[PDB]
Copies of this chain bind each other. A is one copy, B any other.
Amino acid sequence: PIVQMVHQAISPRTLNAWVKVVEEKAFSPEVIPMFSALSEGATPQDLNTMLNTVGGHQAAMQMLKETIDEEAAEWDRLHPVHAGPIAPGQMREPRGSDIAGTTSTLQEQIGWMTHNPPIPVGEIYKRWIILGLNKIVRMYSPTSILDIRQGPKEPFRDYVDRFYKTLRAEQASQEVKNWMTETLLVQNANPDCKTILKALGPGATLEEMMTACQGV
């Protein structure tokens, strides 16, 4: 990575941390922040490192390649490279593949990130990666949010745990999510607690809802 701005190789424990994550948890929503976290300040070399050191889950990893490409081609369209001698004081325009680390050197990468104005390739690529991770997570969720219904003898607090778990992996904007929260959660609660909540009105907080259904 690069700490704010002097350059560093990615640390063995960052690395090791990132590997373990994927072994243990597969593609679980939390992986994603973890990833970002482990990649704070990362160059594309470092991001590639993280990605290539995953073994197994190769269908996913392939899918992530495609996505990155899609994002790369989109970059190139918007940002077409111009012909000419890159002057002494300057540095070349980055392609998609230069962004993905594939067709750029560590110097070039370091070039783009530090230069003024900053061309934050490390952060760009990361976005594309995260993008591709969401595709995966969302695909690899077995359950839809519509399906999460409160078991007859299920404490409310567990149902909520399954709801927002399943929600965290859904393909949807916030506005949509909001709607799902405001609509479904109460709709799919078990009759006993369903009633109780209805009786609070439709603007009570979660704290209020979970404490309303606590005894039941």
Contacts and interface: CB of A to CB of B under 8 A. Distances in A.
B53 A45 contact: no
A210 B48 CA distance: 24
A4 to B, nearest CB: 4
Copies in the complex: 6
B17 A210 contact: no
A108 B138 CA distance: 31
Contacts of A10: 37, 40
B63 A207 contact: yes
A211 interface: yes
Contact of A210 (B14, B45, B139): B139
Given A1-B9, A11-B12, A12-B11, A210 B37 contact: no
A48 B66 contact: no
B49 A37 contact: yes
A49 B63 contact: no
Given A3-B9, A16-B17, A62-B164, 13 more contacts: A1-B9, A3-B8, A4-B7, A10-B40, A12-B17, A15-B17, A30-B52, A59-B157, A62-B206, A63-B207, A66-B205, A66-B206, A67-B207
Interface of A: 1, 3-4, 6-17, 25, 28-30, 32-34, 36-38, 40-41, 45, 48-49, 52-59, 61-63, 66-67, 110, 135, 139, 157, 160-161, 163-165, 168, 205-207, 210-211
